[PDB]
Amino acid sequence: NNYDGDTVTFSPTGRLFQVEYALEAIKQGSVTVGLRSNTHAVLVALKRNADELSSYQKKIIKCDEHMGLSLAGLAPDARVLSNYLRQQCNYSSLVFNRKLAVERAGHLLCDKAQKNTQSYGGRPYGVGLLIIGYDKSGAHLLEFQPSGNVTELYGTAIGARSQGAKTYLERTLDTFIKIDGNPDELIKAGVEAISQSLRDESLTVDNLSIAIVGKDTPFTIYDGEAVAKYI
Amino acid sequence: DRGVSTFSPEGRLFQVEYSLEAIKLGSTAIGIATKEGVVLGVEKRATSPLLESDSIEKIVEIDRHIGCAMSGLTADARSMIEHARTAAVTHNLYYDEDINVESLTQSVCDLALRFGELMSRPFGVALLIAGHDADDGYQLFHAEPSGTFYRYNAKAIGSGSEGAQAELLNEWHSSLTLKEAELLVLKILKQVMEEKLDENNAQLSCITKQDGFKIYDNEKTAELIKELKEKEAAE
Amino acid sequence: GYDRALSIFSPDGHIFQVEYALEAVKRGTCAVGVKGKNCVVLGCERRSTLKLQDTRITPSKVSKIDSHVVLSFSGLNADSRILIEKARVEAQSHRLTLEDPVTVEYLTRYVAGVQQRYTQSGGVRPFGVSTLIAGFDPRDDEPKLYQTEPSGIYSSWSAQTIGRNSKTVREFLEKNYDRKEPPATVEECVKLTVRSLLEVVQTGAKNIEITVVKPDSDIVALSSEEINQYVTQIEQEKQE
Amino acid sequence: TTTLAFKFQHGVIVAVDSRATAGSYISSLRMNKVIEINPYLLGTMSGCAADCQYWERLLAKECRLYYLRNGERISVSAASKLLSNMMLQYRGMGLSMGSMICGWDKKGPGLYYVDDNGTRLSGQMFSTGSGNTYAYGVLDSNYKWDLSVEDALYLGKRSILAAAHRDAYSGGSVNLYHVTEDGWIYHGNHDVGELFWKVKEEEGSFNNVIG
Amino acid sequence: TQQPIVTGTSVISMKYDNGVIIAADNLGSYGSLLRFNGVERLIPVGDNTVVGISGDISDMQHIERLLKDLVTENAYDNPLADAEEALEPSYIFEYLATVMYQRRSKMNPLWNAIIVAGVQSNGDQFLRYVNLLGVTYSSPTLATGFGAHMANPLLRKVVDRESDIPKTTVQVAEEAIVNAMRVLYYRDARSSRNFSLAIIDKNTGLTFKKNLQVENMKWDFAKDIKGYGTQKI
Amino acid sequence: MDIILGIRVQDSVILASSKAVTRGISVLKDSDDKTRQLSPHTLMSFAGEAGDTVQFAEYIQANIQLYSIREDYELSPQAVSSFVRQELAKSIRSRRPYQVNVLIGGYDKKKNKPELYQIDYLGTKVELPYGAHGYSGFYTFSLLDHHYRPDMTTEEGLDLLKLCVQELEKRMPMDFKGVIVKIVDKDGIRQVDDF
Amino acid sequence: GSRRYDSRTTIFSPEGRLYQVEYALESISHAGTAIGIMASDGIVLAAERKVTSTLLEQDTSTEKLYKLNDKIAVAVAGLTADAEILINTARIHAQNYLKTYNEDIPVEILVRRLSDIKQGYTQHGGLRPFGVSFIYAGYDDRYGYQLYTSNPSGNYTGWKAISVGANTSAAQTLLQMDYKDDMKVDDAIELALKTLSKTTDSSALTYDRLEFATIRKGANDGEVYQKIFKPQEIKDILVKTGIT
Amino acid sequence: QFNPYGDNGGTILGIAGEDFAVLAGDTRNITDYSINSRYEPKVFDCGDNIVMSANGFAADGDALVKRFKNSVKWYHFDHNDKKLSINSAARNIQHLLYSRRFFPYYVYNIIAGLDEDGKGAVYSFDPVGSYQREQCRAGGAAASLIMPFLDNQVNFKNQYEPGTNGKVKKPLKYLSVEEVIKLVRDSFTSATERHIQVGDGLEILIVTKDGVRKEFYELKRD
Ligand SMILES: *[C@@](C)(CO)[C@](*)(O)[C@H](Cc1ccccc1)NC(=O)[C@H](Cc1ccc(OC)cc1)NC(=O)[C@H](C)NC(=O)C1=CC2=CCC=CC2=C1C
Ligand SMILES: [Mg+2]
């Protein structure tokens, strides 16, 4: 109300409204799902178009051979943050000959987002990210909020109508975690999860976007007729 | 007052949303992509008859394989074009090749959100970036001041945009020829323009693999206008 | 440093500071530009509220940017000096790095770019000035006349006016200026420029300044008596 | 190296050798010492190969940008000056570049000499490199404005040959160019070994050499 | 640009079937003066890596602290710091190699020659060299300073190529290293009798041996040597 | 470059400057004009290290032309020479000084007098009836000391200048390929095409 | 943050005026009147000190008239402190020009420089403008005797006669009436004092309430002399012209 | 005084075939008269069917390869996984080298792969960035020993057809991969004999449309 003019101002109840408004931009964004087993980690994203003449905005970004994320909210902010991750993944490789741990990647994103919430002049990031990866401790899935909060999960979803997919994953927890050494079945579970967040529209060939990473699988993105198999 | 990089309660940047309103006041620009080429056309909209209309430059060459049309606060576009031209030629210097249309568009859009308290406000102009490369063929992009860019088969921006976009919805198909696309831009421009469309207050351009980016002569456009009138009177 | 964003968008999509800068131009004295077949004339109003003035030393309204290009303006006088100085520096800088003088179109594009930069830079306000830039390109006999404004847009004009009561003199020019046959001689071009100012000026005494620019760096400013002869002839034809 | 270039009635001839040395070792037999800046602009190379390639390929970037901004080809005079101003930024830093900017523009054909010191000279005929003295000997005695395209191409070719023979740091092959108002025209790569014997027989020159 | 003041001499090392061995004497020389007799130049990093350093001792002490700080920093927000995400020999080496090359590129080098010896997660042997110029190389045997000239020849008789590594036991390898250290004591004027030796095995882990001495030395034949040519008495 | 001479007579200033440019052991050009017009009645000849000469001259030219436009007025030769001296005196303590020696010949339209200023690369300025830079004065000053009068005509000044060039051509080891002569008077600057 | 407390000194009004410039001019209108009159053989500068006291040391006092160099002087109207900042800058510019070109600075060039500094404070920096208006009286060999004025907007104009400060409307009318082109310095002195005597808010015009100066070619042969009048000399010229 | 440069010896060789290309180099690393390693790889697969070797000062060579490999990675990120063509890589490397015009990478660099028409390609660089496409190039310590042999046995220089006596040249018939590898092995065996910094081992990387293949051969260890 009087305390939402900038990010440097707490409300009387201890809230940061600019951060909460940035969180709102994620809810307006298109749905995206994340889930993993012990061998693989999968991203599934519903892409959004402007109209029938337009293309479907890309949702998934590759950060390294073993890591990447999907976005929901302001796409340019995802480009800035994914660019930062690319550099950090790259600094780890060039200096330490070491693939960056997914957990440490989250800690770096948290700290970068935080600086924008405590300083005058700047603004919070207006995007949410789902980071998947495979490192020395196996498969991983992270959820990033621009408040700074980063959370390691078995599965999750963010965006509009994301609650439906999140409930499904909460039921299916014991099943999909056990899907080891079977990439296609893990994607099926992800496609079935994101389907719980659809209304009116359904999953078409240029609508759906899938990504996967695993034990002997580099981070690869599937679009177009490559995802027709899963429709 | 309030921050320039402030979020609204709905999760949108105030300044970006307000710049979009300035673009709605701008003169109409239309782009149509085909397998034979991409066509770009604009409304010149001279404020007075004494203004020499050929000095109105709302269609612009970025490289031999990339063209650009603008709508909104057109003065803001000059630095964007300058950056685009530099990026295109600099990549040619570093890699001895043409730069991808998408990569060029992305480089332009990286400027968009460089504002705060860098420049003091977002750009008040939208760009239709049309071009060709070997990998993805003929392409048309719509570059906004939000930093977002969408690829389009056909797109209209400016004051007559939503009326033109609905028309492009019905008319566009994947088998359009270049000649058909030219007439289609002229048709839709004539529809949304206030003043009567002629070769002096409207301008056409295209980008083909063979000849590259070309702005059409007033004599060449005049014939396409006369060809349009006759084919509409034909039924 | 002072970084405050003064020129910003409003809910309706307007930059008020840029629009208020146009109001400062509206307040400024009238300036007019007319191009003939082989020349360009720049007319300028001098408000007669200020007498006891020393006309020898008072800053003239028309300023030479180079030997072949001139610049007149309407709006804040102090602001115009900054643009003129920058333009003059760029003119010599172009000669120095490219070995050709600037084209009128290039000089205009530079001045307009400066004005634009001041609409999206922190800590600065827009120039309260619109300019008329006229001249002849090197080794070219085609006349050139351009206009700029605070927003940074620029364009070429067969004839144009700016400043206070510019709406009236533009009305006059639109009906009197024929594109198919422009003022063939210098006389006809000056006569049409004085006529247009007489719609607005008041007295035709020391209130009208005229500057004729011809090809190949031939620039001269008319005197009081020379202009007074045009004023005399116009009204004597009008009494009929 | 040996490079030359000269203006004449039908434009400008540009001829260069192709040898590259690293001390007394011939590192390259066939190196391109001409840059194709644009269809109407050429640039010769003498000195440090890296410096010549980098700065002239960068000049071509700046010349291309000139065309985009102005919708018009850059002049030979302006192009040469941009390059000389680049050399002037790295004043005394150790760059070794000697080039001739050859082209056709609105003033007609243009030829400018430019070097690492920042020197920029307009002229009808220039020659740079370790073998320039040998080329100047042939050029000065045989040059005319009234030369035919065929004879002018030969003169430049023969002038490089003279230098390739005497100068140990010049040779390999001859690259020829002819600049017209419709642009430059490449006139081939000519091996000196074969060209020498051919010229010796046909011309009767190099009598002192046995073959 | 500087000059080394207090210096440490040869560091020698080799691979064997199950791991790596590395050794270095305990001397800190001040030119020709044998100033400091209790200097440890083998520095363990965790239980899987030993970094042996020769050259300037002040720069060695600096590197020692960078490594100590590296372990501290790796443990930060890392639940698997004593397990999967522990420091590897290849990580530690590349870090040092990055620093060494950066310092030489600023014309202010760390005046050292370093050998990183360890065993990786998958049981693979790691042995790589880096110096003040940022030059890196790997080999079945590695040695710095005088060791390069005298020790390598002896150690290469045991492991001449990659295929000889599985055939070489820890007893044979240690024996060869200890003999090499004796030879260096005979012939290097800036060496000492006292030294330290470290073994990193993929089964038995890190064994760090201190206060070792060169023994079984041959000197008796000196009594018979008289004069420099013609002298008999 | 090599030789630059200057002589001030009754009603004009005459500058003579060599035409040669040499790179290594080869003379690249024999028609080089070692001079720039600073203003309609002010001319500056120059000689020094390669490259620096032209850059400095063109930099000075730009500054004076900028002044002329801003004030719509031509600076006096004295004012220009003082500006040039300051730029050189500023330069001599720079990281990399500009190694350029100049002669400034101008006609003061206010005083109706020709003026010749000699300035070296250190910023050492002197007004003279006749001047030179480098070794040129070693050969020529004896002739000028003997033959020079202040009431000389322009034609007499050219004849005395021919004698100076003839002496240089006889006793100098270097071939400077003749000179380009320019006259500065009340009517402006003009070149003597036959010399 | 800090934005909350920013007055924004460099913005346009909806009408296209600069708020702070307009308010600075309002400040200047309450300052003591200063008059400049240009004649064929010299220039006069007259100015009124503001409500003084008997205990003010007048002979060592200077609030209105200042020397920029030997050829140029200024009369001040507004904040004295602000004026001194600008005056010292102008004195330096004059010396820089003299060092560079070895010639005394032309009057207009000095005026333009100061006026450009004032302009800067109205367009960028976020600082308040200088609350000062100057009358410049000077001589050079191009245009001879010259009068200029500058105000906080950074705009400057040339004059035959001009007033700044209080009651300029009334003062300018009186000057426009009695001024003629063939006028001389002694006559201009009389005009300046008569104008102040009629426009003053004080009961009577006395020597202790005035600062006075002339720039004359009344110096031995072709050269220019600046005369800052002493208290006793102002008292004499008041009796001579018949005001006291 | 500190000397930031060194010489690690070694020798490299690139040959362009009709539809293939090879980049070979010995595996010996040295300082002065000592051997550092008998097997220290010097030719690297950089991705996108491009192989690279920076011979001279190993620390500068390792840094350059490391940076180019990195440049390939960021080329994929920035330009939608587009394949970096051999000509584009060459120009990129020129700029990497010239970044240090005033503190050069003391290395002679060669890369090899296939052009966009599928034909074999070799590009050669000097330490400061001059580059050019070649058919055949040896670099490093024994470059002067090997190049003349390749002029003769690859481009048939000074070879004429019997009976004509110098009138007709030997025609420039193309060479197979098996024939090229023979010339490479003989080149290095010969270099090893007469150059002290060459020996120990020979590693060859062959590039075809099918990918990158390796071959290793022992050399004399003295
Ligand atoms: C003629 C052959 C005179 O020698 C002629 O000038 C050619 C010109 C030319 C132009 C374009 C492409 C190729 C050749 N000049 C050379 O070939 C040139 C001569 C030269 C060598 C070295 C320097 O200083 C670096 C200046 C001029 N040769 C080279 O540029 C060769 C390729 N450069 C080197 O061999 C070289 C070794 C080296 C070690 C450390 C740092 C730099 C190094 C270079 C450039
Ligand atoms: Mg050997």
Coordinates of all heavy atoms in Angstrom, one line a residue, chain D residues 123-152:
Chain D
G123 N 49.1 9.1 -54.2 CA 50.1 9.1 -55.3 C 49.7 8.2 -56.4 O 48.7 7.4 -56.3
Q124 N 50.4 8.3 -57.5 CA 50.1 7.5 -58.7 C 50.6 6.1 -58.7 O 50.1 5.2 -59.2 CB 50.6 8.2 -60.0 CG 49.7 9.3 -60.4 CD 50.2 10.0 -61.7 OE1 50.7 11.2 -61.6 NE2 50.1 9.3 -62.8
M125 N 51.8 6.0 -58.0 CA 52.5 4.7 -58.0 C 53.2 4.5 -56.6 O 53.9 5.5 -56.2 CB 53.5 4.7 -59.1 CG 54.4 3.5 -59.2 SD 55.9 3.8 -60.2 CE 55.2 4.5 -61.7
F126 N 53.1 3.4 -56.1 CA 53.8 3.0 -54.8 C 54.3 1.6 -54.9 O 53.8 0.8 -55.7 CB 52.9 3.2 -53.6 CG 52.6 4.6 -53.3 CD1 51.3 5.1 -53.5 CD2 53.5 5.4 -52.7 CE1 51.0 6.4 -53.1 CE2 53.3 6.7 -52.3 CZ 52.0 7.2 -52.6
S127 N 55.3 1.3 -54.0 CA 55.8 -0.1 -53.9 C 56.4 -0.2 -52.5 O 57.2 0.6 -52.1 CB 56.8 -0.4 -55.0 OG 57.2 -1.7 -54.9
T128 N 56.0 -1.3 -51.8 CA 56.4 -1.5 -50.4 C 57.1 -2.9 -50.3 O 56.8 -3.8 -51.1 CB 55.3 -1.4 -49.4 OG1 54.5 -2.6 -49.4 CG2 54.3 -0.2 -49.8
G129 N 57.9 -3.0 -49.2 CA 58.5 -4.3 -48.9 C 60.0 -4.3 -49.2 O 60.5 -3.4 -49.7
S130 N 60.6 -5.4 -48.8 CA 62.1 -5.6 -49.0 C 62.5 -5.5 -50.4 O 63.7 -5.2 -50.7 CB 62.5 -6.9 -48.4 OG 61.6 -8.0 -48.7
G131 N 61.6 -5.8 -51.4 CA 62.0 -5.8 -52.8 C 61.4 -4.6 -53.6 O 61.4 -4.6 -54.8
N132 N 61.0 -3.6 -52.9 CA 60.4 -2.4 -53.6 C 61.3 -1.7 -54.5 O 60.9 -1.2 -55.5 CB 59.7 -1.4 -52.5 CG 60.8 -0.6 -51.8 OD1 60.9 0.6 -52.1 ND2 61.5 -1.2 -50.9
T133 N 62.6 -1.6 -54.2 CA 63.6 -1.0 -55.0 C 63.7 -1.6 -56.4 O 63.9 -0.9 -57.4 CB 65.0 -1.0 -54.3 OG1 65.4 -2.3 -54.0 CG2 65.0 -0.1 -53.1
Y134 N 63.7 -2.9 -56.4 CA 63.8 -3.6 -57.7 C 62.5 -3.4 -58.6 O 62.7 -3.3 -59.8 CB 63.9 -5.1 -57.5 CG 65.0 -5.5 -56.5 CD1 64.8 -5.9 -55.2 CD2 66.4 -5.4 -56.9 CE1 65.8 -6.2 -54.3 CE2 67.4 -5.7 -56.0 CZ 67.1 -6.1 -54.7 OH 68.1 -6.4 -53.8
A135 N 61.4 -3.3 -57.9 CA 60.1 -3.1 -58.6 C 60.0 -1.6 -59.2 O 59.6 -1.4 -60.3 CB 58.9 -3.3 -57.7
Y136 N 60.5 -0.7 -58.4 CA 60.5 0.7 -58.8 C 61.4 0.9 -60.0 O 61.1 1.8 -60.9 CB 61.0 1.6 -57.7 CG 60.0 2.1 -56.7 CD1 60.2 2.0 -55.3 CD2 58.8 2.8 -57.1 CE1 59.2 2.4 -54.4 CE2 57.9 3.2 -56.2 CZ 58.1 3.1 -54.9 OH 57.1 3.5 -54.0
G137 N 62.4 0.2 -60.2 CA 63.3 0.2 -61.3 C 62.6 0.0 -62.6 O 62.8 0.7 -63.6
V138 N 61.8 -1.1 -62.6 CA 61.1 -1.5 -63.8 C 59.9 -0.5 -64.0 O 59.7 -0.1 -65.2 CB 60.5 -2.9 -63.7 CG1 59.8 -3.3 -65.0 CG2 61.6 -3.9 -63.4
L139 N 59.2 -0.2 -63.0 CA 58.0 0.7 -63.0 C 58.3 2.0 -63.6 O 57.7 2.5 -64.5 CB 57.4 0.8 -61.6 CG 56.6 -0.4 -61.0 CD1 56.3 -0.1 -59.6 CD2 55.3 -0.6 -61.8
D140 N 59.4 2.7 -63.0 CA 59.7 4.1 -63.4 C 60.1 4.2 -64.8 O 59.8 5.3 -65.4 CB 60.8 4.6 -62.5 CG 60.4 4.9 -61.0 OD1 59.2 5.3 -60.9 OD2 61.2 4.7 -60.1
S141 N 60.8 3.2 -65.4 CA 61.2 3.3 -66.8 C 60.2 2.9 -67.8 O 60.3 3.3 -69.0 CB 62.5 2.4 -67.0 OG 62.1 1.0 -66.7
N142 N 59.1 2.2 -67.4 CA 58.1 1.7 -68.3 C 56.7 2.2 -68.1 O 55.8 2.0 -68.9 CB 58.1 0.2 -68.2 CG 59.3 -0.5 -68.9 OD1 60.1 -1.1 -68.2 ND2 59.5 -0.3 -70.2
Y143 N 56.5 3.0 -67.0 CA 55.2 3.5 -66.7 C 54.7 4.6 -67.6 O 55.5 5.5 -67.9 CB 55.1 3.9 -65.2 CG 53.8 4.6 -64.9 CD1 52.6 3.9 -64.5 CD2 53.7 6.0 -64.9 CE1 51.4 4.6 -64.2 CE2 52.5 6.7 -64.6 CZ 51.4 5.9 -64.3 OH 50.2 6.6 -64.0
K144 N 53.4 4.6 -68.0 CA 52.8 5.6 -68.7 C 51.3 5.7 -68.2 O 50.8 4.7 -67.8 CB 52.8 5.5 -70.2 CG 54.1 5.4 -70.9 CD 54.0 5.1 -72.3 CE 55.3 5.0 -73.0 NZ 55.1 4.6 -74.5
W145 N 50.7 6.8 -68.3 CA 49.3 6.9 -68.0 C 48.5 6.3 -69.2 O 47.4 5.7 -69.0 CB 48.8 8.4 -67.9 CG 47.4 8.6 -67.6 CD1 46.4 8.9 -68.5 CD2 46.8 8.4 -66.3 NE1 45.2 9.0 -67.8 CE2 45.4 8.7 -66.5 CE3 47.2 8.1 -65.0 CZ2 44.5 8.6 -65.4 CZ3 46.3 8.1 -64.0 CH2 45.0 8.3 -64.2
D146 N 49.1 6.3 -70.4 CA 48.4 5.8 -71.6 C 48.5 4.3 -71.8 O 48.3 3.8 -72.9 CB 49.0 6.5 -72.9 CG 49.0 8.0 -72.8 OD1 48.0 8.6 -72.4 OD2 50.1 8.6 -73.1
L147 N 48.8 3.6 -70.7 CA 48.9 2.1 -70.8 C 47.6 1.4 -71.0 O 46.6 1.8 -70.6 CB 49.6 1.6 -69.5 CG 51.0 1.0 -69.6 CD1 52.0 2.0 -70.2 CD2 51.5 0.6 -68.2
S148 N 47.7 0.3 -71.8 CA 46.5 -0.6 -72.0 C 46.4 -1.5 -70.8 O 47.4 -1.8 -70.2 CB 46.6 -1.3 -73.3 OG 47.8 -2.2 -73.3
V149 N 45.2 -2.0 -70.5 CA 44.9 -2.9 -69.4 C 45.8 -4.1 -69.5 O 46.4 -4.6 -68.5 CB 43.4 -3.4 -69.4 CG1 43.2 -4.5 -68.4 CG2 42.5 -2.2 -69.2
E150 N 46.0 -4.6 -70.7 CA 46.9 -5.8 -71.0 C 48.3 -5.5 -70.6 O 49.0 -6.3 -70.0 CB 46.7 -6.3 -72.4 CG 47.4 -7.6 -72.7 CD 47.2 -8.1 -74.1 OE1 47.1 -7.3 -75.0 OE2 47.1 -9.3 -74.3
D151 N 48.8 -4.4 -71.1 CA 50.2 -4.0 -70.9 C 50.5 -3.6 -69.4 O 51.6 -3.8 -68.9 CB 50.6 -2.8 -71.8 CG 50.9 -3.3 -73.2 OD1 50.9 -4.5 -73.5 OD2 51.1 -2.4 -74.1
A152 N 49.5 -3.0 -68.8 CA 49.6 -2.5 -67.4 C 49.7 -3.7 -66.4 O 50.5 -3.7 -65.5 CB 48.5 -1.6 -67.0

